[PDB]
């Protein structure tokens, strides 16, 4: 019977706002920088399980060599 | 040493990735993947994703050799722990419970819908019992198996399946257990107690 | 049948506005009963307040009776139930209310009766623990206040018109009807000034009866609605409201805990400052809150950060004095964010 959620009070204590006044860290965070060097960016390009697992360990600059490799992978 | 450590770890990752390509070759004809499968928790941050992908790409291609390499992996884990801890078997120590936790991690991948879960897991329990009785006991007594702590791992897999086949596995089990082994219940034989409660 | 008319695809709002204004002239009481039923039924209630109940029962007993006949299924109500029909319903709701009030500004508002009834009813609905009534009353009262802001703008404009005619007659110092037109314009100017005083009094009544309870609501969305509409009014009638006396409330609401509310406040602050090429007051407010704004540029919610950076861009446009070196260095480091 009467399956509606009843709300006891709508008042909220001022102390929590005063806490946010003294300490507002709870809505801030630290700046997450993008990778600052080339090495980690090229690694991030061919990184991940699918990309690492779908290309040879020795890079192949000509796609002509890519077709013989990618051909035989079920 | 920042750059050197980053390059060394990535180079290692590339080598292991080439070895995972060889793991696909292991799916066709190679073997001896137990060591790479074992090093999943101690090297979790380096290799969690690769080990998970290897497990998935072995489940989707051949469940049979999947369950083979899984059982050989657990054989390697058990043989390393027994060599490490000798006679006591250190059930109290965290290590063995952590291996059981890894076993639960292995269990999570399995899905009830698959037919092979209805027969590969059955074989897994078969071989886990066989492993528990792999080595015979010199004295005190002929019943108590040594290497016996593997049944605490196998009890973690007996939860999954299955009501009808529980009798069938038990009829296979009676080739290994005896009447007074079934009857006796004490703190050393708790693995069997849990197995019967799971059967 | 008003609720269904507003929901089911009305072909034109102005037509039913004109028909209702004529019918209200025909009978105040029946049309007011329809309005009470309208306010109840926009929250989805299907009960009915009766004529004897309307004229005789007190509002708290009426609202309790409508809780009895609320006939809700869950604790969800139309302002929180999903689907396009309820959003379209809200749009039609605000459109009808605003056009209805804006075309009646010369008669109904000055009857000393309608506003007292509506205010008392909404204050009771907004003080009720039943959240659905309190929510619909908040949005409705904000829309009502915006209509009254238009009333205030229209009144001031008309006062300027009568002042200009007064000044033209102050130029025309010779003429038998000159004294007559000067007196009539003074009479009209005084009547509009007294009317204006009543309007601001009613505005103050609404503000202190609603906003002070609703800037601090348990529901974050209600607080956000309040900040939205105060930004609308100050964008709408800047000359009379853009001072610290009203800014302080915004200052308090800058410390909201929820990102959604911050996004609404940030958008309102961004919109208001861009309105004037040459700054209209608030310099003290900028000095007080600038540093906390530039600290809020690193919000967990990316949209908040975007709004913050555009605010700092406005701070640059207005002054170039307010910014420090460290502020510039911090934002230049923020150019390399992942987002």
Does A39 contact B at CB distance below 8 Å?
Answer: yes
Output the CA–CA distances (angstroms, integers) from residue C245 to C241, C272, C276, C281, C306, in the order listed.
8, 17, 20, 12, 28
Whether the CB-CB separation of C99 and C13 falls below 8 Å is answered with yes
Q: How far is CA C112 from the centre of its chain?
A: 21
Chain B residues near any Cβ of chain A (below 8 Å): 3, 6-7, 10, 13-15, 17-18, 20-21, 49-50, 53
Determination technique used: cryo-EM
Whether the CB-CB separation of C44 and C10 falls below 8 Å is answered with no
Residue (of B21, B27, B28, B19) closest to B58 by Cα position: B27
Gyration radius from chain B CA atoms: 19
Does C5 contact A at CB distance below 8 Å?
Answer: no
DSSP string, C27-53: -HHHHHHHHHHHHHHTTT------HHH
Output the CA–CA distances (angstroms, integers) from residue C28 to C34, C114, C165, in the order listed.
10, 9, 36
Whether the CB-CB separation of C38 and C2 falls below 8 Å is answered with yes
Nearest CA of chain A to the CA of C217: how many Å?
Answer: 6
Q: Backbone phi, then psi, for C215, in 5-degree steps?
A: -75, -15
- Tokens matching residue A31: 């700046």
DSSP helix/strand/coil, A7: coil
- Tokens matching residue B136: 């015979």
The Cα–Cα gap between C260 and C262 comes to 5
The Cα–Cα gap between A23 and B159 comes to 49
The Cα–Cα gap between B26 and B69 comes to 10
Whether the CB-CB separation of B117 and B161 falls below 8 Å is answered with yes
- Tokens matching residue C156: 């001031």
* Residue A8 CB neighbour total at 10 angstroms: 6
**Exposed/middle/buried for residue C25 (C-beta within 10 Å: 0-12, 13-18, 19+):** exposed
Tell me the CB-side half-sphere exposure of residue C62, using CA atoms within 13 A: 23
* Residue A41 CB neighbour total at 10 angstroms: 12
Whether the CB-CB separation of B169 and B126 falls below 8 Å is answered with yes
Angle (deg, nearest 10), helices C131-171 and C28-41? 130
Helix (H) or strand (E) holding B9: helix B2-28
**Exposed/middle/buried for residue C272 (C-beta within 10 Å: 0-12, 13-18, 19+):** buried
Tell me the CB-side half-sphere exposure of residue C119, using CA atoms within 13 A: 19
- B/e letters for A14-24, b = 16+ CB within 10 Å, e = fewer, are eeeeeeeeeee
Neighbours of A, requiring at least 3 CB pairs below 8 Å, are: B, C
The Cα–Cα gap between C232 and C238 comes to 10
Does A71 contact B at CB distance below 8 Å?
Answer: no
Does C217 contact A at CB distance below 8 Å?
Answer: yes
Gyration radius from chain A CA atoms: 28
Q: Residue A20: which of C134, C257, C298 has the nearest Cβ?
A: C257
**Exposed/middle/buried for residue C230 (C-beta within 10 Å: 0-12, 13-18, 19+):** buried
First to last CA, chain A: 60
The Cα–Cα gap between B94 and B74 comes to 17
DSSP helix/strand/coil, A28: strand
- Tokens matching residue B157: 């897999």
**Exposed/middle/buried for residue A62 (C-beta within 10 Å: 0-12, 13-18, 19+):** exposed
Whether the CB-CB separation of C152 and C237 falls below 8 Å is answered with yes
Residue (of C201, C219, C199) closest to C136 by Cα position: C219
Tell me the CB-side half-sphere exposure of residue C257, using CA atoms within 13 A: 14
Looking at the DSSP bridge assignments, the partners of residue C299 are A28
Residues 6+ apart with CB under 8 A from B71: B124, B127, B128, B131
CA–CA–CA angle B142, B146, B150 (5° rounding): 130
CA–CA–CA angle B76, B78, B84 (5° rounding): 100
Looking at beta carbons, which residues of chain A come within 8 Å of C300? 27-29
The Cα–Cα gap between B139 and B141 comes to 5
Neighbours of C, requiring at least 3 CB pairs below 8 Å, are: A
Whether the CB-CB separation of C226 and C256 falls below 8 Å is answered with no
Helix (H) or strand (E) holding C313: helix C302-318
DSSP helix/strand/coil, A33: strand
Q: Residue A57: which of B7, B14, B49 has the nearest Cβ?
A: B14
Neighbours of B, requiring at least 3 CB pairs below 8 Å, are: A
Residue (of B103, B155, B164) closest to B132 by Cα position: B155
The Cα–Cα gap between C325 and C247 comes to 28
Whether the CB-CB separation of C164 and C74 falls below 8 Å is answered with no
Q: How many residues does chain C have?
A: 339
Q: DSSP secondary-structure letter at A25?
A: G
Whether the CB-CB separation of B125 and B110 falls below 8 Å is answered with no
Residues 6+ apart with CB under 8 A from B12: B46
DSSP string, C106-160: TTGGGSSSHHHHHHHHHHHHHHSS-HHHHHHHHHHHHHHHHHHHHHHHHHHHHHH
Whether the CB-CB separation of C89 and C78 falls below 8 Å is answered with yes
Residues 6+ apart with CB under 8 A from B124: B67, B70, B71, B157
DSSP helix/strand/coil, C337: strand
**Exposed/middle/buried for residue C306 (C-beta within 10 Å: 0-12, 13-18, 19+):** middle
Looking at the DSSP bridge assignments, the partners of residue C337 are A33
Looking at beta carbons, which residues of chain C come within 8 Å of A11? 216, 218
**Exposed/middle/buried for residue C207 (C-beta within 10 Å: 0-12, 13-18, 19+):** middle
- Bond before C152 cis per omega within 30 degrees: no
Does A57 contact B at CB distance below 8 Å?
Answer: yes
- Tell me the structure's resolution in angstroms, rounded to a single decimal: 5.3
* Residue B162 CB neighbour total at 10 angstroms: 13
Residue (of C318, C246, C316) closest to C276 by Cα position: C318
- B/e letters for C131-164, b = 16+ CB within 10 Å, e = fewer, are bbbbbbbbbbbbbbbbbbbbbbeebbebbeebee
First to last CA, chain B: 56
CB pairs under 8 A between A and B: 19
First to last CA, chain C: 50
DSSP helix/strand/coil, C299: strand
The Cα–Cα gap between C290 and C185 comes to 47
The Cα–Cα gap between B109 and B125 comes to 17
* Residue C242 CB neighbour total at 10 angstroms: 20
The Cα–Cα gap between C107 and C331 comes to 55
- B/e letters for B26-54, b = 16+ CB within 10 Å, e = fewer, are bbeeeeebbebbbebeeeeeebeebbebb
Q: Backbone phi, then psi, for B11, in 5-degree steps?
A: -60, -40
Q: DSSP secondary-structure letter at C210?
A: I
Residues 6+ apart with CB under 8 A from A19: none
Whether the CB-CB separation of B154 and B96 falls below 8 Å is answered with no
The Cα–Cα gap between B91 and B113 comes to 34
């Amino acid at each position: 019977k009467r399956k509606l959620i009843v709300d006891s009070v709508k008042e909220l204590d001022s102390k929590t706002i005063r806490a946010q006044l003294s300490d507002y860290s709870d809505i801030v965070t630290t700046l997450d920088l993008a990778p600052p060097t080339k090495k980690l960016m090229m690694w991030k390009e061919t990184g991940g399980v699918e990309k690492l697992f779908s290309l040879p360990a020795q890079p192949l600059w000509n796609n002509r060599l890519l077709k013989l490799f990618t051909r035989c992978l079920t | 040493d920042e750059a050197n450590k980053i390059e060394a770890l990535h180079k290692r990752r590339n080598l292991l990735a080439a070895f995972s390509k060889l793991i696909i070759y292991d799916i066709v004809d190679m073997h001896a993947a137990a060591d790479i499968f074992k090093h999943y928790m101690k090297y979790y941050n380096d290799y969690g994703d690769i080990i998970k992908e290897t497990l998935s790409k072995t489940r989707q291609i051949d469940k049979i050799q999947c369950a083979k390499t899984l059982i050989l992996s657990l054989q390697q884990l058990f043989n390393e722990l027994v060599q490490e801890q000798g006679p006591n078997l250190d059930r109290t120590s965290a290590h063995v419970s952590g291996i059981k936790e890894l076993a639960r991690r292995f269990a999570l991948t399995f899905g009830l819908d698959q037919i092979k879960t209805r027969e590969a897991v059955a074989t897994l329990h078969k071989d886990g019992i066989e492993f528990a009785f792999k080595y015979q006991n010199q004295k005190g007594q002929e019943y108590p198996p040594p290497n016996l702590a593997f049944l605490e791992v196998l009890s973690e897999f007996s939860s999954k399946l299955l009501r009808q086949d529980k009798k069938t596995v038990h009829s296979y089990l009676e080739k290994f257990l005896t009447e007074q082994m079934m009857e006796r219940r004490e703190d050393v034989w708790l693995p069997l107690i849990s197995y019967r409660n799971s059967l | 049948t008003l609720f269904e008319v507003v929901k089911l695809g009305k072909s034109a709002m102005q037509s039913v506005v004109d028909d209702w204004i004529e019918s209200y002239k025909q009978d105040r009481d029946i049309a007011l009963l329809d309005l009470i039923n309208f306010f109840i039924q926009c929250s989805g209630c299907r009960g009915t307040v009766r004529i004897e109940m309307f004229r005789n029962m007190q509002n708290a007993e009426i609202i309790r009776k409508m809780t009895e006949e609320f006939d809700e299924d869950s604790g969800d109500y139309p302002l929180t139930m999903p689907g396009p029909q309820w959003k379209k319903f809200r749009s039609n709701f605000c459109e009808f209310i605003g056009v209805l009030i804006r075309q009646c500004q010369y008669s109904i508002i000055y009857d000393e009766y309608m506003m007292d009834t509506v205010i008392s009813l909404l204050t009771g609905l907004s003080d009720s623990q039943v959240r659905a009534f309190r929510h619909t009353s908040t949005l409705a009262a904000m829309k009502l206040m915006t209509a009254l802001v238009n009333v205030a703008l229209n009144l001031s404009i008309h006062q300027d018109n009568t002042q200009r005619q007064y000044e033209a007659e102050r130029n025309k110092m010779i003429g038998k009807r000159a004294n007559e037109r000067l007196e009539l314009l003074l009479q009209k100017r005084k009547e509009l000034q007294e009317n204006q005083d009543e309007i601001e009094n009613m505005m103050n009544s609404i503000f202190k009866g609603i906003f002070v309870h609703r800037y601090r609501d348990a529901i974050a969305e209600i607080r956000a609605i309040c900040i939205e509409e105060i930004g609308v009014w100050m964008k709408m009638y800047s000359d009379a409201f853009l001072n610290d006396s009203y800014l302080k409330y915004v200052g308090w609401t800058l410390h909201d805990r929820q990102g959604e509310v911050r996004l609404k406040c940030l958008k309102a602050l961004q919109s208001l400052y861009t309105n004037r090429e040459l700054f209209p007051k608030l310099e003290l407010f900028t000095n007080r809150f600038k540093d906390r704004i530039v600290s809020m540029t690193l919000d967990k919610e990316y949209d908040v950060a975007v709004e913050a950076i555009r605010l700092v861009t406005l701070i640059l446009h207005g002054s170039e004095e307010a910014l420090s070196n460290e502020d510039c260095e911090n934002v230049y480091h923020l150019v390399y964010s992942a987002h």
